[PDB]
């Protein structure tokens, strides 16, 4: 199968730079040219350019001339792109392709601040009282930047779940929450959310306990 | 640059129903438009190139067509995976430009919400800050309003809402609303509760929680 | 004030060493004679010798000799102990003490040391798993309510177990601990309060201990709401 | 050496009554004897020096006397905080030899325990091991019972004891159990009760949950 495997999400200062890498497989590399694509928060798709894996030719969307610098490395069959001057007008999604584009990476994240990171507090949602089903969950408040993944039980609990987008606070920090319905009658089950914050290198176990009295 | 417009942003349509979504170039393309799918997910897929010709994997119920400045895709039996971003690209001449996109969701039989309320932990109020959240689950249309009330006061300006996309399979949405309140705020008080209006509630339900006392 | 500050508590493997350090203050260290003593879990105090830190002069109980070594650093004010070729018998707490003369010969240890435990095993440090022990008010006419912290599964001792950064001390009980049938530890600390409810008051267990570097905070949720 | 003895090793005294403390040496030691009090805490501090000589803040209600083989330690009028245990030392000569020690605990009326059941937390149980805490609070005397059941069946060789040391304040004691099970046996049964039979207790109290619920 065609597949094309972007680096994770990335934060980085204004004014820096930044290279995003796209590792390719199931073809041969250097018969397809790569095209990269931009996708602002809510926003349309944007072309940046194109590069010609075989030689390094390259043409740039006039917008992203100074902006955007392509390469690959055909040993390891992988392009790169690496923005520079960066502003936060270039926090986005970044996706890699094969060129129609017939298949495309997944999008790599870029948040561009000069705030620092910050991991997550997890908090317990647990009703007050002891229907078909009960609720409960994780609340994951003020972490910075995006993102953030949530599991429950190691992923062996998938029904039920819902993970909200996260919203960001007025304290520049972002929150969200997982919860979690299940039976009403949950005797012989415990309900513990795993929280990943890479940027921060943080991973929280928390078991919800119920309030049963 | 050539200008690509989806003069419909937004678009809901019952399952079964036949879907056609509208791009128009600022000058002749000459057949030289794609058509993508972004889920959700953010994941994007080929599938329409050259006006009409159909991608590897895409079912025959997906169809493109037009000349000139203007094209059409059509969806001609809507399933409840194609819940998804659809958007047109012109590779007439550089740079490639893309539409702006038009966002389709499925229209359901109306829902109402199952409604509860999480009080904040210990564990956070601790630290000086109490975070109250009233859960809306699997709901149908969008549109709701949840009010916060404090003894019986309706809270203003100090509370923040996050949905979650449209379920693949029910089609439905949940929300989630949090209050946020210092310690001293949250202690002053008794009654914590969301006050909810749907569509499908005959009238407003209320889900509230005395804090001890 | 006179104070005799000894080193934390240790895990050594029988026949091996193990050195343990008195840190002064509060007086000239040259001037007086300092002494240890053993104290086995449950047992009676054992003089095993002194020293003087002047010259650095020793005498040994002869149950000691193959087994203690004193010395002292002038320079730190600072007498140390070496035990040799442990065994489990040698598991207990020693203390440094400092001894004063009264009359021509009349003699007594005045100051004495916090104590260091020293624990001889084979097996492994184990940091503690931290649980709540959450209040339920099983009637209405209940005059107290209770919570705490199970410190299970840890070795070896000591634990140390606050509440609210130590704020809270009143109605605290903390367990001895009881060695399990895996040979590991494990204790409770519990809170009791008057049933006022429990006020604006929140309730957090500090669980430190020192051999594994583990310190554990966990809040335990009153869970003093109701829906109905 | 110079074997030290404390024919009583265990003494328990009203507050305001007077005690003596006994010390014998198994040959003429000529007053050089010492006392010393032991805390609870472990800490130790001397108490008279050279038969009868008081040491630095020990207050006046502490004197001792003797000579030749025999020496007494008395407290004129006993205050909670005299809760200890007191040790003797001779040194006429090499080796410096203690007594056994004295264990002083006080005499107060009769006080029934207060008694709390814990269930295992979800915490743990996920873990595989339920810890069941059944604890007895500020009671006098310290001898009591407690006997586990579960659906009504005696546990027998399955939990575990530990007693504090008496309060220097209200010299009660308090004593928690612990039941041990594993998750698979725990969930088993329903009904968890610890039993207690103490005399200031009327008849045994019993406290339960049933698991689930």
């Known amino acids: 199968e065609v597949q094309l495997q972007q680096s994770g999400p990335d934060l980085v200062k204004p004014g820096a730079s930044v290279k995003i890498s796209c590792k390719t497989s199931?073809?041969?590399?250097?018969?397809?040219?790569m095209h990269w694509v931009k996708q602002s928060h809510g926003k349309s798709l944007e072309w940046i350019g194109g590069?010609?894996?075989?030689?390094?030719?390259?043409s740039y969307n006039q917008k992203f001339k100074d902006k955007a610098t392509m390469t690959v490395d055909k040993s390891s069959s992988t392009g790169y792109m690496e923005l520079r001057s960066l502003t936060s007008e270039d926090s986005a999604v970044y996706y890699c392709?094969?060129?129609?584009?017939?298949?495309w990476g997944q999008g790599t994240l870029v948040t561009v601040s000069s705030a620092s990171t910050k991991g997550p507090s997890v908090f317990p949602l647990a009703p007050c009282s002891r229907e078909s089903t009960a609720a409960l969950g994780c609340l994951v408040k003020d972490y910075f930047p995006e993102p953030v993944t949530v599991s429950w039980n190691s992923g062996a609990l998938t029904s039920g779940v819902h993970t909200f987008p996260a919203v960001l606070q007025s304290s520049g920090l972002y929150s969200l929450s997982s919860v979690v319905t299940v039976p009403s009658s949950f005797g012989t089950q415990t309900y513990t959310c795993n929280v990943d914050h890479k940027p921060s290198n943080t991973k929280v176990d928390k078991t919800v306990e119920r309030c049963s009295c | 640059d050539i200008q690509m417009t989806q003069t419909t942003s937004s678009l809901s349509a019952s399952l079964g129903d036949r879907v056609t979504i509208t791009c128009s170039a600022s000058?002749?393309?000459?057949?030289?438009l794609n058509w993508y799918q972004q889920k959700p997910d953010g994941t994007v897929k080929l599938l329409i190139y050259?006006?009409?010709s159909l991608h590897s994997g895409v079912p025959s119920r997906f169809s493109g067509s037009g000349s000139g400045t203007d094209y059409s895709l059509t969806i001609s039996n809507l399933e409840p995976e194609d819940i998804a971003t659809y958007y047109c690209?012109?590779?007439?001449?550089?740079?490639?430009?893309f539409g702006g996109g038009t966002k389709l969701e499925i229209k359901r039989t109306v829902a109402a919400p199952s409604v509860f309320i999480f009080p904040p932990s210990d564990e956070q109020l601790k630290s000086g800050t109490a975070s109250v959240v009233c859960l809306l689950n699997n709901f149908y249309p969008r549109e709701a309003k949840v009010q916060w009330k404090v003894d019986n006061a309706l809270q203003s300006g100090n509370s923040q809402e996050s949905v979650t996309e449209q379920d693949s399979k029910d089609s439905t949405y949940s929300l989630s609303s949090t209050l946020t309140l210092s310690k001293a705020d949250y202690e002053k008080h008794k009654v914590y509760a969301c006050e909810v209006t749907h569509q499908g509630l005959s009238s407003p339900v209320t889900k509230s929680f005395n804090r001890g006392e | 004030?006179?104070?005799?500050?000894?080193?934390?508590?240790?895990?050594?493997?029988?026949?091996?060493?193990?050195?343990?350090?008195?840190?002064?203050?509060?007086?000239?260290?040259?001037?007086?004679?300092?002494?240890?003593?053993?104290?086995?879990?449950?047992?009676?105090?054992?003089?095993?010798?002194?020293?003087?830190?002047?010259?650095?002069?020793?005498?040994?109980?002869?149950?000691?000799?193959?087994?203690?070594?004193?010395?002292?650093?002038?320079?730190?004010?600072?007498?140390?102990?070496?035990?040799?070729?442990?065994?489990?018998?040698?598991?207990?707490?020693?203390?440094?003490?400092?001894?004063?003369?009264?009359?021509?010969?009349?003699?007594?240890?005045?100051?004495?040391?916090?104590?260091?435990?020293?624990?001889?095993?084979?097996?492994?440090?184990?940091?503690?798993?931290?649980?709540?022990?959450?209040?339920?008010?099983?009637?209405?006419?209940?005059?107290?309510?209770?919570?705490?912290?199970?410190?299970?599964?840890?070795?070896?001792?000591?634990?140390?177990?606050?509440?609210?950064?130590?704020?809270?001390?009143?109605?605290?009980?903390?367990?001895?601990?009881?060695?399990?049938?895996?040979?590991?530890?494990?204790?409770?600390?519990?809170?009791?309060?008057?049933?006022?409810?429990?006020?604006?008051?929140?309730?957090?267990?500090?669980?430190?201990?020192?051999?594994?570097?583990?310190?554990?905070?966990?809040?335990?949720?009153?869970?003093?709401?109701?829906?109905? | 050496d110079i074997q030290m003895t404390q024919t009583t090793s265990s003494l328990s005294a009203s507050l305001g009554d007077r005690v003596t403390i006994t010390c014998?040496?198994?040959?003429?030691?000529?007053?050089?004897?010492?006392?010393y009090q032991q805390k609870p805490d472990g800490t130790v501090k001397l108490?008279?020096?050279?038969?009868?000589?008081?040491?630095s803040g020990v207050p006046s209600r502490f004197s001792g006397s003797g000579s030749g083989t025999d020496y007494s330690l008395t407290i004129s009028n006993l205050e909670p905080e005299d809760i200890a245990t007191?040790?003797?030392?001779?040194?006429?000569?090499?080796?410096?030899?203690?007594?056994?020690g004295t264990k002083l605990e006080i005499k107060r009326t009769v006080a029934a325990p207060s008694v709390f059941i814990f269930p295992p937390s979800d915490e743990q149980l996920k873990s595989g091991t339920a810890s069941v805490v059944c604890l007895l609070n500020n009671f006098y005397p310290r001898e009591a019972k407690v006997q586990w059941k579960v659906d009504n069946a005696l546990q027998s060789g399955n939990s575990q004891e530990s007693v504090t040391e008496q309060d220097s304040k209200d010299s009660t004691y308090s004593l928690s159990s612990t039941l041990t099970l594993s998750k698979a046996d725990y969930e088993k049964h329903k009904v968890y009760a610890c039993e207690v039979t103490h005399q200031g207790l009327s008849s045994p109290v019993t406290k339960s949950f049933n698991r689930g619920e």
């Open positions: 392709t094969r060129r129609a584009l017939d298949y």
């Open positions: 199931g073809y041969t590399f250097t018969e397809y040219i």
């Open positions: 590069i010609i894996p075989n030689n390094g030719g390259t």
């Open positions: 000058q002749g393309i000459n057949n030289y």
């Open positions: 050259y006006t009409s």
């Open positions: 690209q012109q590779y007439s001449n550089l740079p490639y430009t």
